Design a protein around this ligand. Structure first.
Ligand SMILES: [Cl-]
Ligand SMILES: [Cl-]
Ligand SMILES: [Cl-]
Ligand SMILES: [Cl-]
Ligand SMILES: [Cl-]
Ligand SMILES: [Cl-]
Lengths: 159, 149
């Protein structure tokens, strides 16, 4: 749609031409800003292309769904869990490539102080993530189960 | 890998840290956060068990909803790990790099992603095709069985 194009044009930070220009620059060295811009563009490009692969898989499985008149309940539940498994494999691939890029672009050593700072931030963010997850999912499932339980009691009272 | 070994490594008097240690610490930390996440899920599920018993909700509904919630939570946990891996990569990477070397790394990352995408397409077409074709065939057979009364 039109609004999706306007919202994207109004948000664009990088072009493909800019990125190719940066990659192909005659400059012997490349600074952290330019490296971050390129990795942000690449992360985004790989994220979009991955989604197109998932669409193509789901379009293909749709042909089997229609051949065997498979109900939507089964189709959507299986598509949902497959999406999760594919995300899982993509994270594992990105993890290896981030480690590859980290070791290839830097020296053998890093300041222990800086490493300890990053590590303390990761640990604090995980505690914060876990607290939030507890509160969010406890409420999501409580409402869903309490509601379904009220619906059952209704059907039970009727009989 | 012990909790004493990793605390010893982080608290080392050594001014710098090598790859071997940095990876052995991030592996231990990824594992520790993975265990701690599972404890949060258990706590949620224990709480929902109280509502299950209050309304006498059947196990079939309970387990199916717990399975789906698990995958949604793990989905958010993978996204959180991805952000924190990216955070650590950008924070520890140096201010300058030889452009030649950067271009080489970038060309490798791009080729690996093309290879990943080709493989993923094929692998997941096969996993879901077999699963759906099998479920479909069993549905037709169950339908013919009821229709032949
Ligand atoms: Cl079904
Ligand atoms: Cl990557
Ligand atoms: Cl470094
Ligand atoms: Cl499972
Ligand atoms: Cl992490
Ligand atoms: Cl890293």
């Amino acid at each position: 749609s039109l609004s999706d194009e306007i919202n994207k044009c109004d948000m664009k930070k990088y072009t493909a031409e800019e990125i190719n220009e940066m990659i192909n620059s005659s400059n012997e060295f490349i600074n952290r800003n330019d490296m971050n811009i390129i990795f942000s563009y690449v992360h985004e490009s790989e994220r979009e292309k991955f989604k197109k692969v998932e669409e193509n898989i789901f379009k293909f499985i749709q042909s089997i769904v229609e051949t065997y008149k498979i109900p939507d309940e089964y189709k959507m539940r299986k598509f949902k869990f497959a999406h999760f498994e594919m995300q899982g494999y993509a994270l594992k691939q990105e993890k290896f490539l981030l480690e590859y890029a980290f070791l290839s672009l830097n020296g053998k050593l890093c300041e222990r102080k800086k490493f300890k700072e990053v590590l303390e931030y990761v640990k604090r963010e995980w505690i914060e993530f876990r607290k939030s997850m507890f509160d969010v999912w406890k409420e999501k499932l409580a409402s869903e189960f309490r509601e379904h339980g009220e619906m059952l009691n209704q059907k039970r009272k009727l009989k």
